[PDB]
RNA sequence: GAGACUUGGGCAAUGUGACUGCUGAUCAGCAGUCACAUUGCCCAAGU
RNA sequence: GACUUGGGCAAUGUGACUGCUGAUCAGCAGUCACAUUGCCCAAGUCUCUU
């Protein structure tokens, strides 16, 4: 609005976005537990949540290209826990991948 | 209010504590609504649905405590006894709670 | 008097019912009122009921 | 009577009426303008009330004149959400509640 | 007979819920009508504008607390004029702002000629603790409720 | 949370009892220790008290307006407990807790 | 064009504007969609000659 | 031998409105070195903007709608006296004379 | 084509739980305003 | 000298009515979280298909 000029609002986001922009080029970011289902090869077990309190908890079992590591993920939600679980597991099977 | 869930506690202590009164007497209570939880134990959870108002007028509970809600118009079976614990206010309270 | 000076985050300012006089914040004036429904069952019924 | 009904109601704020029948009492402005403002804000956060503020003499002189003098105004602050900026005033009234 | 062939309906206000309930059950007991009710407790906000007109197409008498009648009549949902009877139970509580005496000065905004008979109920007439005078009392009373 | 954790297995219409309900052996010396008037100081009588009864100290500054600090203690016990006062007060109100609750 | 309006408003009628059947019922009026390329074309079954 | 920064206390007498904000939590805050403590008399340009700026948030957080004076005072040497000692000390004086 | 599996965009509700906000009335304290009663004093008149 | 009327100045009170503060109680509204089982679309991986 101050500016008037698209090519300079293109400037200031280029210049906010460009490491996110070269990242994310070389590597797309995807949804974390699509990513694990699409990685066909660590086959995630993500056992039945279950709740204490108001605090749910999902255990996963995933085959981390060498052994069936266990990993547990806490949220205040069934979805919630399952997404920390799967991209507790995805991190655990990049640092394996190394 | 809070007068209220304090004696029902002392009575059914009481009640329970005494060999006459322990058959005889039921004690009930209520207040207005933001209803105050009527256990003590902290649970998260209640089962029971029936209302105060019922038990009192089928005859379960025959001891009912009330707090400025019971005074107005209440249609009941016929009561022997009414009790004012607290001093008299108002001349409208008076000759209700009459 | 310990609790008057807790300092709690940024909260709603409260005022009486016709704005000159102050209030505490919701959650201090909720503390105060449990513990002085305590003390007032307390001093009119007995131990036992406190 | 007509006589005694108008002039023991009718001598206090006036109510308001649409051109569609609808009825809006004095009474029930603050209720009103409480529930909008409840309506409005986007977040959980974002929870926001009206600022009521009331005049000073000098203000009371420089906005109203000399007809202000004794008398009580409120200024009414809305939140910036809203429509209004214009920080509305109330007439002089015999009390800070009226 | 249907509300927009000029139907009337019955409104029987109350101070409080369980008050309110129980005259319900007592009206529904002594009379055939299938009578409603309305309290904040469960909820009416989302009984809307056209969920009212098929409510009161629904029901012929409206038991229920004064404030969920008040928010009704103000919002003009139903007129006074279809309205054939108004009874508030406890009318000694009608003085001040109070809901019932608010009810009481939105009748005169509409049109005199058709407001609905007004039977108030009750056991006391004296509000307060000002029962010294009690002329004035009664003379406010009936002027907040025209009768 | 490093706290708020409840395994004192006791119910909450008795779990005051548990500072009862330890063993004489931690329970008589610190009984001894707290009725004892020689201590040096405040302080020093409730830190060798807390250190009988082998209850770690966590003390840390609760921000305040006031211009003396307003500090808070935390004892990391099984059983969730916290005071707070002015530093001055602190110690003696930490002596005040402990001689009514370990009867 | 309603400049003073809530952002909430803005963003529903946002979506319905950019929703899937008021793009529809432009193209369908706009008579475009008559000529779409859809069908996988097999010449010998799914079509017939000028 | 001790006392405040010579830069603070300017700013503390010179700027009134300023100084009504000031609270002992920002002067904490300025736990200023050895040099500045000993030698330099006053804290640095850095602490200084850092102490303006805390004071400056001071009036707008939670801080503000209240009242520090009655521990500050002693800082540039206010004291609060109630009437009736004010008079009691005259009248003690005309006591000892006489 | 038959399908299983996942994230979505949602549409629904059966729960249930907690939060927040406001109106009204009553009492108590304080402040102020209306009228009225009692004991006086004095004056104005008329016969 | 009785009789009558009226007014004014006093004090001693009473009856209420508002205004402010605090407390108590009833009365409404806006939400939010979230287990449970359902329904319709979008894109995915695989058996089969091939």
Redesign the interface.
Known sequence: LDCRDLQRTWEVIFNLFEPELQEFTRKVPINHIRQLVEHKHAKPVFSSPIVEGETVMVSCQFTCMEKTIKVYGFGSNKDQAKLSAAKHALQQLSKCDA | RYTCKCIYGLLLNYIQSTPELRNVLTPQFMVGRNNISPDFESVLERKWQKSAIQQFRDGNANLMICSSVLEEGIDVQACNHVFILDPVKTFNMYVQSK | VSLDLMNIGVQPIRRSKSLQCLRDPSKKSFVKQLFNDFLYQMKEYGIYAA | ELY???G???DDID?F?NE??????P??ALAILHRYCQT?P?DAFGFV?PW???LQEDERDRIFGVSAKGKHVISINMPV?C?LRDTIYSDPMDN??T | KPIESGGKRALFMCNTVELARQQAMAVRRCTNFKVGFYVGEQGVDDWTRGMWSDEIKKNQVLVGTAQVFLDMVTQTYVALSSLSVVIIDECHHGTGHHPFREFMRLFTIANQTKLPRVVGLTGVLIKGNEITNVATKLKELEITYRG | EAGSVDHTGMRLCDRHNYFKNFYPTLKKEAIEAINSDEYESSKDKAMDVMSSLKITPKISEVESSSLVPLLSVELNCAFDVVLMAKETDIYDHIIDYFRTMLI | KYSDWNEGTLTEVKSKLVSNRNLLFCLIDADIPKTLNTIQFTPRYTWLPP | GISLPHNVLALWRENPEFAKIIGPHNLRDLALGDEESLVKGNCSDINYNRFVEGCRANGQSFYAGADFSSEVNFCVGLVTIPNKVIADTLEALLGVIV
């Open positions: 005694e009904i108008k023991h109601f009718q109510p009426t569609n029948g609808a009825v809006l009492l009474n029930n409005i986007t009330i009521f503020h009331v959400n429509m800070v509640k």
